[PDB]
Design an enzyme around this catalytic site. Structure first.
Site, PDB file in Angstrom:
ATOM      1  N   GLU A  71       0.818  -1.224   0.000  1.00  0.00           N
ATOM      2  CA  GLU A  71       0.000   0.000   0.000  1.00  0.00           C
ATOM      3  C   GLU A  71       0.850   1.272   0.000  1.00  0.00           C
ATOM      4  OE1 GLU A  71      -1.361  -0.831   4.293  1.00  0.00           O
ATOM      5  OE2 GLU A  71      -0.532   1.228   4.311  1.00  0.00           O
ATOM      6  N   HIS A 100     -10.438   4.324   2.859  1.00  0.00           N
ATOM      7  CA  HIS A 100      -9.627   3.520   3.747  1.00  0.00           C
ATOM      8  C   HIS A 100      -9.853   2.006   3.657  1.00  0.00           C
ATOM      9  CE1 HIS A 100      -6.519   4.080   6.831  1.00  0.00           C
ATOM     10  NE2 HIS A 100      -6.841   2.826   7.099  1.00  0.00           N
TER      11      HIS A 100
END
Length: 108
Positions: A71, A100
């Site tokens: 990520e 998120h």
């Protein structure tokens, strides 16, 4: 600075690594970042957090034999971290999320 969805996605594909403005969480902590203090930009001017392993616990992204995920924070400037992330696989699938990791959209 390269910190947009398309900008980082294309850089990943061309170079197989994140651009020079990214540091991992262990690197940010070494510089004095503390989660919740929102101080990344003061301890590491122009840096964004990225490169750490994404676990995919909730199975939201396609799994494959030997495929792992990483990520990177997107659109970060300063203060508290946002909800924008690029999530990229070892085989170069690239997804974005603006909530998120709640939802994803495939972009490469």
């Amino acid at each position: 600075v390269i910190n947009t969805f398309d900008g980082v996605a294309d850089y990943l594909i061309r170079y197989k690594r994140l651009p020079n403005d990214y540091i991992t969480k262990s690197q940010a902590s070494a510089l004095g970042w503390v989660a919740s203090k929102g101080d990344l930009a003061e301890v590491a001017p122009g840096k964004s957090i990225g490169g750490d392993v994404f676990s995919n616990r909730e199975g939201r992204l396609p799994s494959a034999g030997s495929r792992t995920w990483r990520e990177a924070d997107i659109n970060y400037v300063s203060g508290f971290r946002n909800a924008d992330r690029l999530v990229y696989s070892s085989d170069w699938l690239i997804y974005k999320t603006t909530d998120h990791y709640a939802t994803f959209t495939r972009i490469r």
